[PDB]
Subunit: 119 residues, 3 copies
């Protein structure tokens, strides 16, 4: 496969099951577009953290982590930072200035799938 | 903004909502002091993991992660490792020898806020 | 102590408390074998994420993260990638091709225990 991207959204917004699936599917479509990967290689998650807070406030906030073996560059990080923030702002009503995004580049010797390392 | 510190505390202690907010605000104050950043830039969270266990035991345990673009030097890590452990021991009564802390230095091209990368 | 390994398992499978402890103890035993560390230094967790999805599907899926200061070499990562995937496939009946594993090598100055940095 080479690279299987992952995107975990953590948020103190109590997202309904439907809104969660909507956000994750739009994020999955964005990741497939930017990283040029089929849906079968993409992992996504939304994790509700009731106690999370930003800026000393309990208002809506999202912390997004994107992890991938390849495709972690300035061009992709710029595009995905833009796309993911807009998706969350529209689907779960978080304000844009209440969205963090973190990009992590993993070595192929550090990642495994089906019990085998990527190389 | 330069750097926006984050601190996520994971614990198998079923902490009450108020105790979680107190621990997070004391840790937020410690981060503001050591990393010299206003509260408006600091994120914190407490995450209850019922199944988490350490040393082959379910007794109280905390795994803390501190993530920041800057401020991840040995001098800051020593001070924050000391301060955070004392805060958790006092607020949720976890034993000091049952507290992990992990520090992560993030690249400004890998971090995003309000849809834009930091650097 | 030198190195204190950690293994978090995230899964959309709603695992019973007993099955969760069963899996974690088998993984803890695997980590002790490969990294040659006594159980008193090993952390493990299982985290149920109802919204997690892989390949555009909600079918059973596990994302495993292994974190340690030492023992993050190709030889250890191969053995643990194989062992952990078999453990999860047997205990919670996740398919092997629905299991990610990520390995992270930590610096000893970035890790702390009992308020003191390791390096
Ligand atoms: Cl809210």
């Amino acid at each position: 496969p080479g690279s299987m991207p992952c995107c975990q959204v953590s948020t103190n917004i109590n997202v309904s099951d439907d809104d969660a699936k909507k956000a994750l599917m739009q994020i999955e479509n964005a990741i497939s577009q930017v990283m040029n990967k089929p849906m079968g290689y993409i992992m996504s998650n939304l994790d509700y953290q009731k106690h999370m807070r930003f800026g000393g406030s309990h208002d809506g906030f999202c912390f997004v982590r994107v992890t991938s073996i390849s495709g972690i560059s300035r061009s992709n990080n710029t595009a995905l930072a833009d796309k993911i923030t807009k998706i969350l702002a529209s689907t779960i009503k978080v304000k844009s200035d209440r969205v963090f995004i973190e990009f992590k580049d993993c070595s192929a010797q550090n990642f495994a799938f089906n019990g085998s390392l990527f190389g």
